Structures are given as structure tokens and as C-alpha cells.
Unconditional design. Sequence first.
Lengths: 217, 217
Amino acid sequence: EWSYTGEHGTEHWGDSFATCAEGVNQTPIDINQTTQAELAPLHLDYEGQVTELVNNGHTIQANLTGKNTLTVDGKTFELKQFHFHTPSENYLKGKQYPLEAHFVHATDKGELAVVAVMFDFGPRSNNELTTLLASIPSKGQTVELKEALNPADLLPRDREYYRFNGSLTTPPCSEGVRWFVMQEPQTSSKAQTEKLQAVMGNNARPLQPLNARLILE
Amino acid sequence: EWSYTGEHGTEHWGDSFATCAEGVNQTPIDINQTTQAELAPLHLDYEGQVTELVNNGHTIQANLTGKNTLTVDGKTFELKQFHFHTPSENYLKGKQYPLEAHFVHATDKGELAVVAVMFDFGPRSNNELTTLLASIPSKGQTVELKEALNPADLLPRDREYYRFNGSLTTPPCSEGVRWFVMQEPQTSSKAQTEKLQAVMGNNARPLQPLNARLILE
Ligand SMILES: [Cl-]
Ligand SMILES: [Zn+2]
Ligand SMILES: [Zn+2]
């Protein structure tokens, strides 16, 4: 239905999804100027498995089993899925990355929090991505992972983050979404990112204005 | 048209003003739990005069002449008006105040910023309020101030503030509004606040959820 370019592209998401066009607390943003703040460490307890990839024609999405939980702000947000954008949607200090992962979590009441991880180029294939992407499903299809994989291993080692209040970056672009963007990029070889990009195409939403928000670190 | 209670009261503002019902970055809030952050001092340069009071059936609003400017975030926000709510709309640490002033500023491009000042009870009449409120207009009317008054003198001496990203507290409840709530209350005698309340009635919007925001100090 909706797309990135064309008649149903980002410029027209408001036709069916009002918040995409009317909201002024949207994601993505350029994380450039920031405010130093006293922020609690995230509690990311990922103990389960990635089971499958789904291609819904918008992204490649990984689904999970087991207990994979983000605890922050006194709320318990279970990891629902993670998925990818090529190129990145958010920027860090004016830099766009080749690949960005969104780990999307929800409280049992439905409140959403996204942990974003940038993937920059490195010389070596990322082993966890090799496992994850061994078979990437085509549009409208799903593939069961051949091999075991814990999503914990896709997070960077260092867990410092930028925090802001934003939205989903895809329709319905709902607001009230906590964003935690990890400061340290993970690595993906250029070949790995190209493999994903050739399936997904350009599925990065354009940058949105910060407006009255401050970005914290 | 719109009101606080009844058919067109706060519970029904969404009928004509969608953001009032759909927004999740709204004002007012209870400023209770906060995040320590490195925030720039506000630059409040009020050098003009309060000319008149207008009663638009929603509040008592004071209009200005001269140069009265808030500079923050590299943007220049000119004071457009200030007005009052009885009781307060925002709370500080779970406490509602008898009276809250909103100093509403706009950049020349139209972007809005509100400086909020709580007024608590004190033994002495506030001299600037005595001047300001010597004649309070009835609904649908305006009164020219009898005496000179610089709005600077209504701000607290100490300028430390809480900051959050929110909305107008009246229709259209627009978002993308910077809120700077002064930490130090000003003083108004109980008699002065009662004088205003008897004209305005209860024009405080109920508290709104913080959602994904953090309040900074
Ligand atoms: Cl915010
Ligand atoms: Zn995403
Ligand atoms: Zn107000």
C-alpha cells in the first residue's frame, strides 16, 4: 500500500495516516546538537532467539521467541521485532550510515520504545548478520532462520545512547515513542549491507525537524 | 465557543480542534520527576509596557508595547501577550498553585514559546498585580491600564526553570511549543487571586500524561 516514493510515498503518507503529516515530534532526526543529561543505563536483557525473517514489502523484519526485554523508566517493554533501513534514517553528527536496525519494543499495554543501532562498514563480515541474512525472503514471504541466533549479539558492546521523544518512522507514524539511539555503531561489511539494500531498496524516511525537543546524552 | 466545562468543555475540544484530543505531547503536566541537564540560562529582556487587559471569555490577557524578547535556542521569540489561569494548570512536585501566568512568545516565523510563572499566596499584595488588575474587564471587553507597568517586574527574581516540550493549553492545543516553567513562584495575595478567579472562573485544563518526554532542570 504505502511506499517511499511515488503516489503513496512519504510525501503522501498523510492521505491515510494523519500523524505522518501533522505530527511535530517525528522520527528520524539528525542527532547533532545535544544536551548533557543524567540518564539511567538501559536494561537490555535479550535471552531468546531470532526465529525468522519476514519481508512485508517495506523492510526485512526479524521475529523472536523467548524473553527479550527492555526495562527503562519503570516500564517493561518486550522486544516485538527488529528490522532494517538502507540507508539509515537517523543521522549521527550529520552522518548518514549505510544501515540502521530498529529494535521495536512494547509494554503489555501497548506503549512503544525503539532502540536504534547504526551499522557502519567494516572489513569483516558481521557473523551475526551472516547468520541472520543467510536467506532473505522476497516480498510477501517469510523464511525460517536455518541457524540459532540471540538478538543480544547484534547490539553494540558499549550501551551509551542518545535519547529523544519521537514517533514511528513508518505509517501510522504514531507519536509518544521513546527513542534510544546507541552511540556506538555496529559493523556490517559493505557486501552485507548491499545484499540487504538490493532486497529492500531505499526505505529511509527523510529527516524531520527537531522543533521544541532536545536530544539528550 | 469552546469552554472548560459542559458541551464544549475540555472533554470535547477534539470536536473542532483535533490536536487537543489526539496529541501525546500536551501541556499541562505535573512537574514531579525530573532529569538533571545542562541547560542555558534564558535571556528575558523585557523593556516595554503593559497597555491593556482583554477578557475574551477564556482568560484575562495583557497586551504589550515595546521590546520584550525571549532569546533561547538561537531563536528570538517576542512576547505577544501574557494571561492567567485560576487555579494553575501545571503542578510543581504534585502541588497545584492558586494562579499561573503564561507569557506567550513567538518568533517572527510563528514558532511559540511559553514562560510560565506560578503565583503562590503571600501576606502582601503584589504591587505589580495591583497595578495590572486595578480594573479587570468583563467578558468581551478590554480596559486600558490606568498606570505604567513593565512586564519584567512580574517575573521572579531567580530565573532557574524546568523545560519541556509541549503544547498550547487552549484550543487549538498546537504542539511544538517550548515550555519554560520558572522554579521560583511569584507572590499574589489570596485576595488578588480571588479577584481574578471571580472574573475568569475555573479556566485550568486537566493534567496531561508525560508519555515519552522527560522534564529537564
Ligand atoms: Cl521531548
Ligand atoms: Zn524502522
Ligand atoms: Zn495559558
